[PDB]
């Protein structure tokens, strides 16, 4: 019944179509950068980290050419609850310190600060405008006494995407978006005819 | 043409083996007779559910008749014999091997 | 072109369900063609007379 109706509808749908019409083409292509967060607070790793939706949007808006995130502060807090992509602020902010920026290799950036604060449950990276990029939480409170907090952001290809790849240069560009470091943002598009399989290199 | 396979899974490990479009073959042997490939197809649905404690994976697969079904005749065979038409249609509009 | 030599002997079946399907069947089809300007009637006289 459904097949007959469907077959009928399709016939009537396509009834006026010029099949010698000028034809045009759009290609659907797909790639992803994974950014990985590591938080070290005086030698203790955070138990969980999220690259928040605000941070994802900061990188998105930067890729369009709007402007790079200006990473300024490491914020620490007293609430490990409700860790999500959706976090726009720390649970309960206690202290804030200005970052030093280090670029250990292509594809990685480190933000670090020296800090004194008792009962640290949560840590975050914050831009000048107050946009949270990451939130990380500890299962047990950390007492910091002139201890170095390090936040490491690492860029990688999402190897789950079939037949597309972000290049090493593209991953470097995403790093440079985060590091305010003059990224080679998208300006052009190319088409070619070599079918040799995709690699980062 | 379709196939359904039912498997036991642990920690979702087998679910990961069957992304959409992956190749599945079913071989059959009765007694000491050699294996016959009875079905070749591609995965369309992987489902895992709680069945009274069991973690049951259903894989559902379709076959090659899908390509004749989900494609349309692009050029017109008005003034062609059915022979000439079959050649034209299969070679232009389908991803399958033509042999006259 | 192919015959399955084994067959289904009276001892080899163990369930069956054989209908004659006839609920869809009709005996007259009229087709409009040529931008709807001409028509042809296909006429199954047997079924019409039998009914």
């Amino acid at each position: 019944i459904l097949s007959e109706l469907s077959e009928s509808v399709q016939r009537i749908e396509m009834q006026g179509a010029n099949r010698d019409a000028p034809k045009n083409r759009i290609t659907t292509t797909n790639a992803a950068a994974i950014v990985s967060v590591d938080v070290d607070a005086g030698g203790t790793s955070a138990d969980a980290d999220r690259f928040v939706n605000d941070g994802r949007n900061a990188v998105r808006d930067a890729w369009t050419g709007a402007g790079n995130p200006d990473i300024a502060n490491i914020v620490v807090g007293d609430d490990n609850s409700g860790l999500s992509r959706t976090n726009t602020t720390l649970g309960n902010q206690t202290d804030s310190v200005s970052v030093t920026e280090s670029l250990p290799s292509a594809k990685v950036v480190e933000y670090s600060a020296t800090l004194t604060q008792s009962g640290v449950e949560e840590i975050g990276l914050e831009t000048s405008t107050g946009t949270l990029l990451t939130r990380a939480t500890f299962e047990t409170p950390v007492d910091l006494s002139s201890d170095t907090v390090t936040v490491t952001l690492t860029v990688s290809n999402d190897d789950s995407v079939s037949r597309g790849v972000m290049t090493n240069d593209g991953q470097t560009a995403v790093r440079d978006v985060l590091a305010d470091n003059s990224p080679t943002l998208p300006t052009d598009y190319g088409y070619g005819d070599d079918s040799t399989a995709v690699a980062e290199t | 043409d379709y196939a359904v396979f039912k498997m036991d899974d642990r920690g979702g490990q087998a679910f990961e083996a069957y992304p959409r479009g992956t190749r599945v073959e079913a071989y059959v042997s009765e007694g000491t007779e050699p294996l016959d490939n009875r079905f070749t197809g591609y995965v369309v649905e992987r489902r895992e559910n709680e069945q009274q404690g069991a973690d049951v994976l259903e894989v559902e697969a379709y076959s090659f008749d899908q390509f004749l079904r989900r494609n349309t005749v692009t050029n017109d065979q008005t003034g062609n014999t059915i022979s000439q038409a079959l050649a034209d249609i299969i070679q232009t509009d389908t991803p399958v091997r033509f042999n006259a | 072109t192919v015959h399955i030599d084994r067959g289904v002997d009276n001892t080899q079946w163990f369930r069956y369900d054989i209908p004659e399907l006839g609920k869809e069947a009709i005996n007259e089809v009229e087709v409009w063609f040529d931008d709807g300007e001409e028509s042809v009637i296909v006429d199954d006289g047997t079924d019409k007379l039998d009914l």
């Binding site: 019944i1 007959e4 109706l5 | 359904v4 069945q51 009274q52 | 609920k23 869809e24």
Partner: peptide
């Protein structure tokens, strides 16, 4: 008792379609 959804739906197909066959299409 665990019931096969494929066999229920496959068995009852004749009866699901009949109300519409009774009305033409």
């Amino acid at each position: 008792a665990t019931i096969d959804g494929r066999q229920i739906s496959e068995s009852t197909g004749r009866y699901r379609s009949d109300p519409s066959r009774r009305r033409g299409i």
